[PDB]
């Protein structure tokens, strides 16, 4: 429950998300 906590909680959600929705091979 704070400014700094949720919204690395959540970026971190997404930044998971992303590098197996991306993955830059080849």
Same mark, same amino acid.
């Given at each position: 429950? +704070?400014?700094?906590?949720? +919204?690395?909680?959540?970026?971190?959600?997404?930044n998971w998300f992303?590098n197996?929705?991306?993955?830059?091979?080849?």
């Amino acid at each position: 429950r +704070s400014a700094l906590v949720n +919204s690395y909680l959540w970026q971190r959600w997404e930044n998971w998300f992303w590098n197996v929705t991306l993955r830059p091979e080849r």
